[PDB]
Design a protein around this nucleic acid. Structure first.
Lengths: 193, 190
DNA sequence: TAGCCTTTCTATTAGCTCTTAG
DNA sequence: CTAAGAGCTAATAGAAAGGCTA
DNA sequence: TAGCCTTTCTATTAGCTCTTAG
DNA sequence: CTAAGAGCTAATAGAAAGGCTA
């Protein structure tokens, strides 16, 4: 909202060169992978005489002066409420990226899944059965069927949950022992129940 | 600040008991550490019959109903801009506490100071020799007498700024390798 | 992976005093 | 949706010098 | 320790494409 | 300013089950 309209900074000298060069490298080798092309483009950059790098550097510097003007005139026409909104939007985006980065990191470190309750075991064992033309409606259905379960049957899912609590404690003790060894004592629970 | 005026949540039963008891314990033991009074207060709570703990829980539950009412009519009267401000204030507070906790932790772990710049070394030695009514107004004198400095005079301080850059690299490889010992690779640069 | 739907759980964190020290 | 990968440039945040008041 | 003042530095992270896969 | 310490209670955030579309 405020962030959407905020002037964006110009790209540096090399990234400018990189974006005219990529489509020509791609058009000549449409099968070769983008990581190989960028790897091939970087050196066209290293090899490029400094008289030619200066053409890209001069454009960057000239656009940097447009940016300074654009951003100064932008920030100074914002109301206090729009300044707060811009700061909250930037903060929220940064936190979304940090949270997402941490989840990918913990998956690479092989963090155990948390205990799956009897309802979670139910949703796994009997979801695609549930009538629904949308995954959200197949779940909406699962919630009613879960309630309609006989007491006899729900105790079957409670024991599956019970034995998964044991799996959680075992795997966590093992994973947390491994994190101290990898030097990630920070990833440990402070309150281990 | 929207958060300043926001109804706060009631304290749980033990903290209600703890409140009335601390003055009594303090008055009876005035040379005792607050940490020891709270330890003895928790002991009284543990010993307290559940019929008496329920008196404090019933008050909590009754105050929880007052809270729900107060917070809903407070938030209903907030403009969209005040709702966004309240949410930003809550998050900023949480992050200020996280950042502050990390700085205290790194000070206990004895993290090396970063490299002092030539300006930094000029402020340290020539600060109290500068005219100024307030510490901010003393720094303006040093900032003005830094700008005016000769290149040869700058080199005298630039002598410390280069030997301190060595001190930083040395102390950091020592501290970072010690942080691997304690199992805190997360605190390294990388 | 996030977010949609509901339900359910674990781990975290909020609250309070009063002194010390960051 | 968007981070990762494959590169480079450089703006950015925050720490650092001092001390006094939150 | 944060934040006030200015200046200065180090470490981080932003930018770009296009495909893959989280 | 406020975290730490010395305790307890419980609200809260976010993960978990599934799959499909950002």
């Amino acid at each position: 909202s405020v962030l959407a309209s905020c002037p964006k900074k110009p790209v540096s000298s090399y990234l400018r060169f990189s974006k005219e060069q990529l489509p020509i490298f791609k058009a000549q080798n449409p099968d070769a992978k983008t990581t190989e092309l960028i790897r091939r483009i970087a050196q066209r950059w290293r090899e490029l005489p400094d008289s030619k790098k200066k053409i890209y550097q001069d454009a960057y510097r000239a656009e940097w002066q447009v940016y300074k003007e654009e951003i100064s005139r932008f920030k100074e026409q914002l109301t206090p409420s729009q300044i707060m909104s811009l700061e909250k939007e930037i903060m929220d985006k940064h936190l979304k990226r940090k949270a997402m980065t941490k989840k990918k990191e913990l998956t690479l470190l092989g963090k155990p899944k948390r205990p799956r309750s009897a309802y979670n075991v139910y949703v796994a064992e009997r979801f695609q059965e549930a009538k629904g033309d949308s995954p959200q409606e197949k779940l909406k259905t699962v919630k009613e069927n879960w309630k309609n379960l006989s007491d006899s049957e729900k105790e079957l899912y409670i024991q599956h949950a019970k034995e998964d609590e044991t799996r959680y404690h075992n795997e966590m003790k093992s994973w947390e022992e491994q994190m101290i060894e990898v030097g990630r004592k920070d990833l440990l629970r402070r309150t281990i129940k």
